[PDB]
Design a protein around this ligand. Structure first.
Ligand SMILES: O=C(Cc1cncc2ccccc12)N(CCC1CCCCC1)Cc1cccs1
Ligand SMILES: O=C(Cc1cncc2ccccc12)N(CCC1CCCCC1)Cc1cccs1
Ligand SMILES: [Cl-]
Lengths: 306, 306
């Protein structure tokens, strides 16, 4: 029992964190095999950041302009190339701690763990989700660039995020490990704004199923709804549209608890209308949207507390 | 910017997790130097748990009755002894991944990271607090016994908790690493209940300072209070008493934000008496009490642990 915002154990990623320095700029790098991945803005001064020409800035660097430190050991950079917004530094040593890994680009609503780092050293681990507006509500200070997001399903680390910047609202923007930004963001200091954020409806429903699995049913009601009527109501509360894919994905949780997906949708419509009336759901007075259907199944028991 | 429930990086602890099997019972063990620590109830069957005589049950066990698996390697048990509610299995091999460590017993209100494990394999990491009623609101399933709680203070892991059981309300009970339970709990399948819990006042104040540091200031007011008047009000809402030690500990945060601790206490008094009025603080509609003053300073200043 219990339901916590749970991150993956970070050890496999900690053994990959290195410090990357180019001139006066220092940030984090991810050392996998003989390559160190880091944000390409490591080659910029604060004066270059408005309209950097990364191809022009990079062509002026030699391998010895990049200082990579792994613990107290300096790695030798023997090559460098840019892939989208990521800089790839080839090093003369393969990381002996390289776990089984893959690079995956995720979709909004997906969750992942972030290993926040400064100067190539891990500071903390937390769980977050790719918001519908493609930002993440992280906890990052200056120097955190290059910190990564990942999932560790079945011993393989799937790296899905690399931190590049903080937007004016205090939210964060980054790329996948191939350097493609999530959302309409660019690695320039030009005025950029996160679009209006919405609640991840499928994740709130998943979390309501987690509440039923853990014994709570106060929020259920005798009603059902069509998928279209649910979306018409949901959009009024800035909730993301629930698609048939989302309904299908909630199938296993629906079968386990005995609550049809559209019946749980009716409960959600009522919660949006009434609030919680001094009650909590899994220790929260807000509807939680950073647990996916997959997270709930992984964390919760396969036996519902009837 | 941003403020997340952040756990310590778990890698140093992951390299210590092993699987301990005694008969049909399998749980987790912590392998440090040449000793594997685990709950003493690993020697019990469900029937033994009703009223166990651990000394009598342990007498019947040989070293070979304990199967310890570290990854895919079986460790050889060369001795066994009990210390309070922890079983200590002496093994023939010192753990080469043993970090610098210490065993510390924490006080209620103190936070720590839990590395939830199953079959000696880490599954997740989350941050929690030792409640004033000595329970932890964890997320644990059957097989999670032996999972540990820890903090990192510089490069030293301080192990403070070992998981033993779940109470009927879904909350958890365990011991320090010397086998002494936190709370009035015993390791026996008998009627036990968590006492009435209270809110960790110093931690709520620390989190209000974190909200201020993050630009959430709507709850600030022109008022101050005395420590005595605040404690009279706090006692009415089942909040823990705020001591002069707590006020001293909040000194740095008070100096950084310009809000005296009793000035923040007057904000908290108003929040208890009036609620949040539809507003949130750091994305929460409840007053969060699982961040200590040290956690807030650490997260807001980017302290690392390589
Ligand atoms: O937002 C950041 C870093 C950052 C990240 N997370 C959190 C942050 C919090 C506060 C300040 C900064 C943060 N940029 C990088 C700043 C460096 C640029 C090169 C020289 C040295 C500073 C700005 C841009 C990146 C891409 C496009 S604009
Ligand atoms: O509570 C647990 C483990 C546990 C922990 N966390 C979470 C749990 C969730 C569900 C069930 C169990 C959990 N005990 C152990 C159950 C037996 C398993 C087989 C061998 C003998 C013990 C019951 C105890 C009573 C008094 C002290 S322990
Ligand atoms: Cl995805």
């Amino acid at each position: 029992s219990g339901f916590r915002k749970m991150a993956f154990p970070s050890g496999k990623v900690e053994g990959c964190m290195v410090q990357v320095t180019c001139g006066t700029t220092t940030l984090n790098g991810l050392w996998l095999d003989d390559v160190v991945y880091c944000p390409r803005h490591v080659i910029c001064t604060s004066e270059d950041m408005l309209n950097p020409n990364y191809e022009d800035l990079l062509i002026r660097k030699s391998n010895h302009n990049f200082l990579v430190q792994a613990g107290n050991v300096q790695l030798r950079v023997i090559g460098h190339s840019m892939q989208n917004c990521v800089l790839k530094l080839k090093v003369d040593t393969a990381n002996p701690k390289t776990p089984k890994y893959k690079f995956v680009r995720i979709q909004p609503g997906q969750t992942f763990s972030v290993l926040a780092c400064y100067n190539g050293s891990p500071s903390g681990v937390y769980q977050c989700a790719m918001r519908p507006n493609f930002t993440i509500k992280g906890s990052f200070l200056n120097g955190s660039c290059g910190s990564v997001g990942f999932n560790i399903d079945y011993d393989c680390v799937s790296f899905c995020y690399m931190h590049h910047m903080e937007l004016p609202t205090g939210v964060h923007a980054g790329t996948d490990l191939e350097g493609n930004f999530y959302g309409p963001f660019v690695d320039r200091q030009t005025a950029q704004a996160a679009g209006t954020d919405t609640t991840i409806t499928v994740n709130v429903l998943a979390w309501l199923y987690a509440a039923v699995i853990n014994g709570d049913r106060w929020f259920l009601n005798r009603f059902t709804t069509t998928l279209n009527d649910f979306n018409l109501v949901a959009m009024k509360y800035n909730y993301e549209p629930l698609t048939q894919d989302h309904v299908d994905i909630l199938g296993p949780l629906s079968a386990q608890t005995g609550i049809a997906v559209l019946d749980m949708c009716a409960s959600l419509k009522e919660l949006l209308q009434n609030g919680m009336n001094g009650r909590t759901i899994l220790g929260s007075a807000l509807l939680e949207d950073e647990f996916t259907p997959f997270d709930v199944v992984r964390q919760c028991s396969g036996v519902t507390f009837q």
